[PDB]
Curated annotation (Swiss-Prot), chain A:
Gene: rpoB
Organism: Escherichia coli (strain K12)
Protein name stated in the entry: DNA-directed RNA polymerase subunit beta
Protein family: Belongs to the RNA polymerase beta chain family.
Uses, biotech or industry: Co-administration of salinamide and rifampicin or salinamide and myxopyronin suppresses the emergence of resistance to both antibiotics.
Transmembrane segments: none
Primary role: DNA-dependent RNA polymerase (RNAP) catalyzes the transcription of DNA into RNA using the four ribonucleoside triphosphates as substrates. Resistance to the antibiotics salinamide A, salinamide B, rifampicin, streptolydigin, CBR703, myxopyronin, and lipiarmycin can result from mutations in this protein.
Domain of life from the UniProt record: Bacteria
Quaternary structure annotation from Swiss-Prot or TrEMBL: The RNAP catalytic core consists of 2 alpha, 1 beta, 1 beta' and 1 omega subunit. When a sigma factor is associated with the core the holoenzyme is formed, which can initiate transcription. The rRNA transcription and antitermination complex (rrnTAC) consists of RNAP, NusA, NusB, NusE (rpsJ), NusG, SubB, ribosomal protein S4, DNA and precursor rRNA; S4 is more flexible than other subunits. In pull-down experiments interacts with CedA.
PTM (free text): Acetylated on several lysine residues in the presence of glucose.
Swiss-Prot record, chain B:
Sample GO molecular function, one term: DNA binding
Protein name, as recorded: RNA polymerase sigma factor RpoD
UniProt keyword annotations, A-Z: Cytoplasm, DNA-binding, Sigma factor, Transcription, Transcription regulation
Region (Sigma-70 factor domain-4): 365-418
Role this protein plays: Sigma factors are initiation factors that promote the attachment of RNA polymerase to specific initiation sites and are then released. This sigma factor is the primary sigma factor during exponential growth. Preferentially transcribes genes associated with fast growth, such as ribosomal operons, other protein-synthesis related genes, rRNA- and tRNA-encoding genes and prfB.
């Protein structure tokens, strides 16, 4: 809506086109991470971690 | 005896059981009678000359290859045109329905029958008769009613319209009625003939259908679609070929059933070709699974189908069918999948309040700015007003100069960038 146009024009926010869908700890839970496991599809390249 | 068997399948089978099969002789008998009816209607159509005129004119207007005569079309129709034209003169020669003119008409029809006509033109010709028949009947039912009820054998007053109808038609009413009723009789014979084969072969339809019934649409839908196919096949069958009827009919029945099961039976309608590809995929997977003794990886499957890997992957993901909103997800049949699904369209009361606050704050900050600067910024971004007016419109309204508006905006940005004024707007920083 127009007011964000005005705001970005004032402050020059690029406003990139991508969301934040990360995994986070459920509220209240508090612990230690003991291991991590990664499963990749056959065609996809493997990351450094994997 | 009917035990109120409400099952529609039982009613269908009970109704179809009465008609008994007959083979190798009837099919020839009924086919002969169908062809006889069609020949009768074609002959009687050829009898009517104005239909021939109209068809020839329509041919001339428009302007299809390989006619079954027991620039090819134009040169073959040139002599037919000449014959028809020279036959018109003989009809004018000393006899309206003279035996010689009738013989010429007969030979013209004999030559004409040797050609092939597109069925749509044949229907057009039939309706060209139906329209005038209905017109003449409608304009005269009132005169017949009046002569029957009042005269019992005005008269000359009503005779004017009857004479006008003859003048418009330009032909004897009696022959028109003869040809029309002959149309009706021939068509009736043809129709009543085809019913017999159709009612005879319903069992064939049943067998072919039940071969496909394994959990598709439903039994009766398959049966009815097959019956459509059977009607088509009865239309297309020729005994002259000398083959058994079933051999021909089965292809049309399978085609109809399979085409319907492709079109319907899915909520999201996959086109036909994709259905064929998925069926190939499944037929290959079974055989390849039993050969290797396990499930085939998509790469090996792609190798066998001679298709690129991505295509196979796309088909695999497209294949799946939607899941019912009432599936019981809880072990106890109390909670259903439907209660578990969230609405996405709604916004949050938090964000609504935030938007309202933002609008108020922007209005407060803008009000503190210079009047012309404030109205310019409103006019440019469409703030508070229904639409945003472009640079040219603002220039022609306030001050023609284009670059002056650019300088106004530059100064407004400079002012609102001053840290004093912007303090509250920073709170809308993360967004």
């Amino acid at each position: 809506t127009p007011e964000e146009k005005l705001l970005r024009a004032i402050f020059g926010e690029k406003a990139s086109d991508v969301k934040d869908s990360s995994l986070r700890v459920p509220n209240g839970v508090s612990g230690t991470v003991i291991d991590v496991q990664v499963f990749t599809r056959d065609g996809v390249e493997k990351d450094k971690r994997a | 005896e009917i035990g109120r068997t409400t099952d529609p399948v039982r009613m269908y089978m009970r109704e179809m059981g009465t008609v008994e099969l007959l083979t190798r002789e009837g099919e020839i008998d009924i086919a002969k009678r169908i062809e006889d009816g069609i020949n009768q209607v074609q002959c009687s159509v050829a009898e009517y000359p104005e239909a021939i005129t109209y068809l020839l004119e329509q041919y001339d207007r428009v302007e299809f290859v390989d006619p079954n005569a027991e620039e090819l079309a134009r040169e073959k129709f040139a002599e037919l045109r000449a014959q028809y034209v020279v036959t018109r003169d003989t009809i004018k020669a000393k006899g309206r329905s003279h035996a010689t003119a009738q013989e010429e008409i007969l030979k013209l029809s004999e030559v004409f029958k040797q050609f092939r006509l597109v069925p749509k033109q044949f229907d057009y010709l039939v309706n060209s008769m139906r329209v005038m028949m209905d017109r003449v009947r409608t304009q005269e039912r009132l005169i017949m009613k009046l002569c029957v009820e009042q005269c019992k054998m005005e008269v000359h007053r009503a005779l004017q319209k009857l004479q006008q109808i003859e003048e418009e038609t330009g032909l004897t009413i009696e022959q028109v009625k003869d040809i029309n009723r002959r149309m009706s009789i021939g068509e009736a014979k043809a129709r009543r003939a085809k019913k017999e084969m159709v009612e005879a072969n319903l069992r064939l339809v049943i067998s072919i259908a039940k071969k496909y019934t394994n959990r598709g649409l439903q039994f009766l839908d398959l049966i009815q679609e097959g019956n459509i196919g059977l009607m088509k096949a009865v239309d297309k069958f020729e005994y002259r070929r000398g083959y058994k009827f079933s051999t021909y009919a089965t292809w049309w029945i399978r085609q109809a059933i399979t085409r319907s099961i492709a079109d319907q039976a899915r909520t999201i309608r996959i086109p036909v070709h994709m259905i064929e590809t998925i069926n190939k995929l499944n037929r290959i997977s079974r055989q390849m699974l039993q050969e290797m003794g396990r499930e085939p990886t998509p790469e090996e499957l792609a190798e066998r189908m001679l298709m690129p890997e991505d295509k196979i992957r796309k088909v695999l993901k497209i294949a799946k069918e939607p899941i019912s909103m009432e599936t019981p997800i809880g072990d106890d049949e109390d909670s259903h999948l439907g209660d578990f699904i969230e609405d996405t369209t709604l916004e949050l009361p938090l964000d609504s309040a935030t938007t309202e606050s933002l609008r108020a704050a922007t209005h407060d900050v803008l009000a503190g700015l210079t009047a012309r600067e404030a109205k310019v910024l409103r006019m440019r971004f469409g703030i508070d007003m229904n639409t945003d007016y472009t640079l040219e419109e603002v220039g022609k309204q306030f001050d023609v100069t284009r670059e002056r508006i650019r300088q106004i905006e530059a100064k407004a940005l400079r002012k609102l960038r001053h840290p004093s004024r912007s303090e509250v707007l920073r709170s809308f920083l993360d967004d």
